[PDB]
């Protein structure tokens, strides 16, 4: 198959990647506007150049113990259809082209977690980056209740 | 060093914009490669200045004991 | 010249963005503080003056005859009157009057409901009318009139009107408040109440929905005003008044701590500073405020919306009196920022099941202000 | 939705006032000098960016099909061809192309004149065409295409084309310039000349007038470009290019002293700094400038418009080469402010007998800049 | 100062490619401006370092005179 | 300072009453706006007096120290 | 200073040709705009050098007066 | 000197743009040639003025050398 390009980033002292085409902007994390009684995944909203963007907690979703504005300093702004949303992360590394051959199965035993959500591990020089299906994850997790 | 870091992060964003532009982005991508190279080089030059500052301040620390000796002799 | 609807709606969105951009420029200009204040104020005033004239021209372009709405009524009225066993004649006044194309699309659903209410409940059977002593044929009048930068659209029948004693008896039977202390205006407000205007059949909510609450909400989402005037044996007059606007709502802007809330200005009765004497801790564990010798429940804004207050239980805030149908309650806030007309922004996916807030708006440099549903907030209080 | 033309023309007038108000704000902001330059430039750039999108949207709203113009041509062409003893068939390309309603009302008179020129002078008699060895039936092609923010409207015939030798012989007979040194471009420019394109019958000036000067002026008052490409025995192609804009003219802005003049950009050939050697005081008392071994008359701007100069007879200004038909002349000015696109303002009652200025525009805080008529200015020089 | 100047030349080349790429080059122009601003910031910072170095050198010359005066006392 | 705050809230209440009374409220709205201004002036003037009081009782501390100093000198 | 003025005028002429070339003149237009910036900067640099020369000539006049005073001493 | 060198780089870009416009780039080539010629002339003038400054500063050093030599006699 044709090569696939990923934006590579850090969360919980581990390395992850997502689809390049769905990424709009990469910006520094600054204080989020809170709304009461919201599901734990949603931090709140922020304003980017006049536009209100939802901000979501990737750290709680992946069961990571990192602290809000202390240990996470970057927001990656993602667009799916008419929905724009920022994922909170430690930082961004580089853009990486991966062939399908160098994508290894995810180690996780939970069925749709290790297939539909986790695409696999990208192997570069025996270093692994966790490839995440952000489109499936946002469409499923936010609408499950 | 912060400006050099900001330049590298801007270059990373610029590379994605060049990729989106496709055929039209090809020359801009080559320029972005040099921007990455200069961002690294600027940081290296700044580090060479830090090494000279450390050596110079080391001379001030050596000089301070000599100045105290000059005060006594 | 004939154009697509989507293009002229996009022009409205763009001139909305221009007004937002002008506000952003004004906020930056105020922070910057230019030396020649008169030169700046004159320049900004000229820009604002041009912007208002430009908006008026865009709205003037969007004008379309009320005839497009009115022309469809005589066939509908005659067949509907025949279905309900009535004899009715229809008078249409002001067909040549002008209003926005989006208003023409949005007005048909509440106007049709008002027309059905006149042909059903309002206008009696022809024998029954003859027995009363009036003409056997009913009179239904739909009138449209230009009024002060608004259009006023009036539905009047020669019917039996709204029986006030029956409304009061239903209110008394449910124990809503004392019938003697309900005004004619409060009785008119009760007509639009969500629990008092219920449809017989249960079905999923719609803009084409049944009931006076749906009528009130449809008018609110045109930024309009609506009132009901009625006399027993004379008939009912309902007036709908529509500005030149987007989804903009007239509100009262308030804070508790730094948290910003908007109270719809049609649901605000009055506002006041409460004294310690008039604050009554009546039995059940729910505080009461006395206003003019009337006991109203008093609710703290931070507590009911589940947000962090500023640590003050001392009596020094401002209390705003709100009405849900015929029932008044008092809502206590730290500070008032005053009356404002605010563009209404969707809550979208995150807030799917939130009940007390129907919308949001954006203030200053990106601050979020939450638009309260007054009857839902009363429902949260009794939860 | 369908709307009045005057309202959408008023929206154009108002967004023109917005651009002027933005320019006034920019001039005052530049004088004021806010401390945070990047924040100011960002804010002003965002306002400008919104203003361009808003203008583009307003222009997109004003779009109507070219079919409204084109659909009237086949009856007109067939009857007109019949009158002139021709056999001609009409091809229409790009009827579904889109352009402004005011362009539609202003293109018909020059386009009709071009169509008459093809059916009269361009396409020969059917026997004459058969004698030439080409089809007896003429081909007339009207084509419209969308080109880079403009619409390009092209009138092409399979006629006899323009006879260059005959045009040069007439130019030589009048002594306009040497025939050898006339380029094909200069010959094409000569077609639109006011004294070379004259009507047979004398009557009062009109927008519906006869002659290529009227055609060029009608296009100029839409802010458009027009060119003529022609080959002897093949036919003539005339292209009219209309931009998405108001009554705006592309100009070159110049000063002599502090007096501001605008030279139409299409009539500017080139501009240069004269040296003392190339300035020749030839007999008759009229100065000549040599450009590339070619002698051009040189005229001082302050003297010919009757204004006070800066007291400088020393060589140090800039000279602009202007062409009237096939004749070039050189116009000497103190300073160039550069190329500018300027809104065209009416002179009105006061200046009704003024011959060398056709319009004015307003610059900065109320400065007046005068729009030169290049052919009229040549006529003033020879008065 | 040379690296900042070279970075300004990269910004010029990016601007030329942005101009030739038209509508697809609209983002390239913003990057070229921002890179030019980062170069301007680097150059201005370098001039302030040069001024502080020159003042520091003058203090060193004065310190040398003071120890020489002490050496003659 | 309290009366000024009451005047400010009363002006906000008055603005709602003016808005309610529409074309009959137009003159009253101007009166409410000026009453809102007078409340701001009253509060501002009260704060300027607070600043003067804070200086004045600080001058009494200085004067008390000088008088005490005059006693022991 | 005179060379800079010729360059400044040449940029105006270049811009007109670039405008005529339209979409295919856009890269040339960037060069013309940058050259117009440089010509204006060059004139300011020449003025500052002229001002420094004027100060230097004044200092020589003071120096001349001082050496004559040294002759009288 | 940096402006003259930057102008020379701009002349190369103009020369490349003239080449990239081919038979329609002949007028661009004339402008590129004039800018290139102006850059060569400004660079020569920059070398001469810098050399004249070096000679002039050399004269100041010769003059100061005479004054100290007179002082120590």
Mutate to test the interface with B, among E5, E12, E21, E45 (most CBs of B within 10 A): E21
Which string of b and e fits D18-48 if b means at least 16 CB within 10 Å?
bbebbebbeebbeebebeeeeebeebbeebe
- By three-state DSSP, how is residue D379 classified? helix
- By three-state DSSP, how is residue D370 classified? strand
Task: Yes or no: say if D357 and D371 are a contact pair by the CB < 8 Å rule.
Answer: yes
Inspect the structure and tell me whether chains G and H have 3 or more CB pairs less than 8 Å apart: yes
CA distance C256 to D68: 61
Q: How was this structure determined?
A: cryo-EM
Breaks (C-N over 2.5 A) in chain C follow: none
Query: Hey, CA dihedral for D93, D95, D101, D106, is it positive or negative?
Result: positive
Chain H residue set in contact with G, beta carbons under 8 Å: 3, 6-7, 10, 13-14, 17, 20-21, 24, 27-28, 31, 34-35, 38, 41-42, 45
Residue ranges in chain G assigned as alpha helix (H):
2-20, 26-72
Please state at what angle helix H2-20 crosses helix G26-72, rounded to 10 degrees.
160
- By three-state DSSP, how is residue B72 classified? helix
Task: Yes or no: say if D28 and C82 are a contact pair by the CB < 8 Å rule.
Answer: no
Which residues face D329 on adjacent strands? D322
CA distance C322 to C262: 12
CA distance C25 to C34: 13
Residue ranges in chain D assigned as alpha helix (H):
5-32, 37-62, 67-70, 73-83, 101-117, 126-132, 164-174, 184-190, 212-220, 301-304, 374-381
Cβ-in-10-Å burial (0-12, 13-18, 19+) of C6 comes to exposed
* Residue A110 DSSP class: S
Q: In 3D, which of D219, D220, D241, D3 has the Cα closest to residue D101?
A: D3
**Dihedral, CA of residue D248, residue D253, residue D256 and residue D261, to nearest 10:** -10
Q: Of the candidates G9, G16, G22, which has its C-beta nearest D318's C-beta?
A: G9
CA distance D51 to D57: 10
- By three-state DSSP, how is residue A105 classified? coil
Q: Are strands C327-333 and C294-300 parallel, antiparallel or unpaired?
A: parallel
CA distance D69 to D108: 7
CA distance C217 to C219: 5
Mutate to test the interface with H, among E4, E6, E7, E12 (most CBs of H within 10 A): E12
CA distance E73 to B70: 12
What count of other Cβ atoms lies within 10 Å of the Cβ of residue D248? 16
What residues in A contact B12, CB-CB < 8 Å?
A: 26, 92, 94-95
CA distance D255 to D278: 23
* Residue A32 DSSP class: P
Backbone angles phi, psi at D89, to 5 degrees: -115, 145
Inspect the structure and tell me whether chains H and F have 3 or more CB pairs less than 8 Å apart: no
Element housing D237 (H / E): strand D235-243
Residue D302: C-alpha distances to residues D259, D368, D371 (Å): 8, 16, 14
Three-state SS string across chain C, please? CECCHHHHHHHHHHHHHHHHHHHHHHHHHHHHCCCCHHHHHHHHHHHHHHHHHHHHHHHHHHEEECHHHHCCHHHHHHHHHHHCCCCEEEEEECCCCEEEHHHHHHHHHHHHHHHHHHHHHHCCCHHHHHHHCCCCCEEEEEEEEECCCEEEEEEEECCCCCCHHHHHHHHHHHCCCCHHHCCHHHHHHHCCCCCCCCCCCCCCCCCCCCCHHHHHHHHHCCCCEEEEEEECCCEEEEEEEEECCCCEEEEEEEEECCEEEEEECCCEEEEECCCHHHEECCCCCCCEEEECCEEEEEEEHHHHCCCCCCCCCCCCCEEEEEEECCEEEEEEECEEEEEEEEECECCCHHHCCCCCEEEEEEECCCEEEEEECHHHHHHHHCC
Residue ranges in F1-73 assigned as alpha helix (H):
2-20, 26-72
Cβ-in-10-Å burial (0-12, 13-18, 19+) of C188 comes to middle
DSSP string across chain E: -HHHHHHHHHHHHHHHHHHHTGGGGHHHHHHHHHHHHHHHHHHHHHHHHHHHHHHHHHHHHHHHHHHHHHHT-
What count of other Cβ atoms lies within 10 Å of the Cβ of residue A96? 16
Contact (CB<8Å) C368/A33: yes
Q: How many separate helices (H) and strands (E) can be counted in chain B? A: 2, 0
* Residue D2 DSSP class: B
Which residues face D268 on adjacent strands? D322
DSSP string across D49-111: HHHHHHHHHHHHHHEEETHHHHTTHHHHHHHHHHHTT--EEEEEE-TT-EEEHHHHHHHHHHH
DSSP string across D124-169: PPHHHHHHHTS-SSEEEEEEEEEETTEEEEEEEE-S----HHHHHH
Residue C87: C-alpha distances to residues C78, C80, C119, E41 (Å): 8, 10, 9, 84
Residue ranges in A2-144 assigned as alpha helix (H):
58-61, 68-71, 134-141
Contact (CB<8Å) D339/G22: no
Which string of b and e fits D146-178 if b means at least 16 CB within 10 Å?
eeeebbbbbbbbbbbbbebeebbeebeeeebbe
Task: Yes or no: say if C69 and C107 are a contact pair by the CB < 8 Å rule.
Answer: yes
Contact (CB<8Å) G13/D272: yes
Which residues, including other chains, have CB under 8 Å from residue E71's CB and lie 6 or more apart? none
State which residue of chain B sits closest to A19, comparing Cα positions.
B16
CA distance A54 to F65: 62
Task: Yes or no: say if C274 and C255 are a contact pair by the CB < 8 Å rule.
Answer: no
Number of independent structural domains in chain A: 1
CA distance D247 to D103: 11
Residue H6: C-alpha distances to residues D2, D264, H36 (Å): 57, 34, 11
Residue D101: C-alpha distances to residues C4, C10, D62, D286, D342 (Å): 15, 20, 6, 49, 22
CA distance D240 to D217: 12
Inspect the structure and tell me whether chains B and E have 3 or more CB pairs less than 8 Å apart: yes
Task: Yes or no: say if C217 and C193 are a contact pair by the CB < 8 Å rule.
Answer: no
What is the widest separation between alpha-carbon atoms in chain H?
76
CA distance C40 to C34: 7
Which residues face D206 on adjacent strands? none
CA distance D238 to C6: 37
What count of other Cβ atoms lies within 10 Å of the Cβ of residue H16? 16
Resolution of this entry in Å? 8.4
Torsion-angle region of residue A13: left (phi > 0), alpha (psi -120 to 50) or beta? left
Task: Yes or no: say if D307 and D257 are a contact pair by the CB < 8 Å rule.
Answer: yes
CA distance D247 to D346: 11
Breaks (C-N over 2.5 A) in chain F follow: none
Which residues face A28 on adjacent strands? A74
What residues in G contact D336, CB-CB < 8 Å?
A: 9, 12
Domain that holds residue A20: 1-145
Task: Looking at the complex, report in whole angstroms how far the Cα of residue A8 sits from the nearest Cα belonging to chain C.
Answer: 27
Backbone angles phi, psi at A112, to 5 degrees: -80, -20
Contact (CB<8Å) A23/B16: yes
């Amino acid at each position: 198959p044709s090569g696939q390009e990923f934006l590579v980033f850090t969360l919980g002292d581990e390395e992850y990647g997502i689809d390049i085409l769905k990424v709009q902007e990469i910006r520094g994390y600054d204080q989020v506007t809170r709304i009461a009684n919201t599901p734990a995944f949603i931090k709140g909203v922020t304003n980017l150049r006049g536009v209100i963007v939802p901000i979501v907690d990737l750290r709680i979703k992946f069961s990571q113990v990192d602290v809000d504005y202390n240990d996470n300093t970057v927001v990656i702004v993602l667009n799916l259809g008419q929905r724009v949303v920022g994922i909170v992360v430690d930082g961004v590394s580089d853009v990486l082209s991966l062939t399908a051959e160098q994508i290894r199965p995810a180690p996780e035993f939970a069925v749709t977690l290790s297939t539909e959500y986790l695409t696999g591990l990208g192997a570069l020089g025996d270093r692994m980056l966790i490839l995440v299906n952000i489109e499936k994850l946002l469409n499923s997790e936010e609408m499950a209740l | 060093d912060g400006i050099a870091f900001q330049t590298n992060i801007l270059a990373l964003n610029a590379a994605v914009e060049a990729a989106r532009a496709g055929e039209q982005g090809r020359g801009f991508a080559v320029v972005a490669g040099e921007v990455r190279n200069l961002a690294q080089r600027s940081a290296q030059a700044a580090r060479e200045i830090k090494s000279l500052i450390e050596d110079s301040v080391g001379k001030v620390d050596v000089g301070s004991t000599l100045v105290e000796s000059a005060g006594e002799t | 010249i004939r154009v697509a609807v989507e293009k002229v709606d996009q022009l409205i969105n763009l001139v909305g963005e221009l007004v937002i951009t002008q506000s952003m420029l004004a906020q930056r200009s105020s922070e910057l503080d230019p030396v020649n204040h008169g030169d700046l104020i004159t320049s900004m005033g000229q820009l604002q003056r041009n912007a208002r004239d430009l908006q008026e021209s865009v709205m003037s372009i969007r004008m379309m005859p009320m005839e497009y709405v009115f022309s469809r009524y005589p066939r509908l009225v005659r067949d509907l009157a025949g279905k309900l066993g009535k004899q009715v004649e229809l008078t249409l006044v002001g067909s040549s009057t002008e209003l926005d194309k989006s208003l023409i699309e949005r007005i048909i659903d509440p106007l049709t409901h008002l027309v059905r209410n006149s042909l059903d409940h309002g206008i009696e059977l022809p024998e029954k009318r003859l027995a009363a002593g009036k003409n056997s044929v009913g009179n239904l009048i739909l009138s449209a009139e230009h009024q002060g930068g608004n259009i006023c659209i009036e539905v009047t029948d020669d019917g039996a009107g709204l029986n006030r004693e029956r409304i009061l008896a239903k209110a008394a039977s449910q124990g809503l408040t004392v019938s003697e202390n309900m005004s004619d205006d409060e009785v008119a407000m009760l007509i639009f109440a969500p629990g008092f205007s219920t449809a017989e059949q249960v079905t999923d909510v719609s803009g084409r929905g049944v009931g006076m609450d749906v009528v009130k909400r449809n008018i609110q989402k045109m930024g309009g005003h609506v009132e009901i005037q009625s006399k027993q044996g004379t008939g009912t007059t309902i007036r709908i008044l529509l500005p030149l606007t987007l989804a903009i709502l007239d509100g009262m802007s308030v804070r508790v701590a730094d948290e910003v809330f908007i109270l719809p200005l049609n649901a605000v009765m009055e506002s006041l500073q409460p004294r310690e004497a008039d604050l009554h801790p009546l039995a059940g564990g729910e505080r009461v405020l006395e206003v003019r010798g009337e006991y109203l429940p008093i609710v703290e804004l931070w507590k009911v919306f589940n947000v962090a207050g500023a640590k003050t239980e001392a009596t020094q805030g401002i209390v705003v009196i709100l009405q849900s149908g015929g029932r008044r309650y008092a809502l206590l806030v730290d500070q008032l920022i005053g009356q404002h007309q605010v563009v209404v922004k969707n809550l979208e996916s995150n807030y799917r099941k939130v009940p007390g807030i129907s919308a949001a708006t954006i203030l200053g440099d990106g601050s979020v202000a939450l638009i309260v549903d007054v009857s839902a907030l009363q429902a949260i209080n009794r939860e």
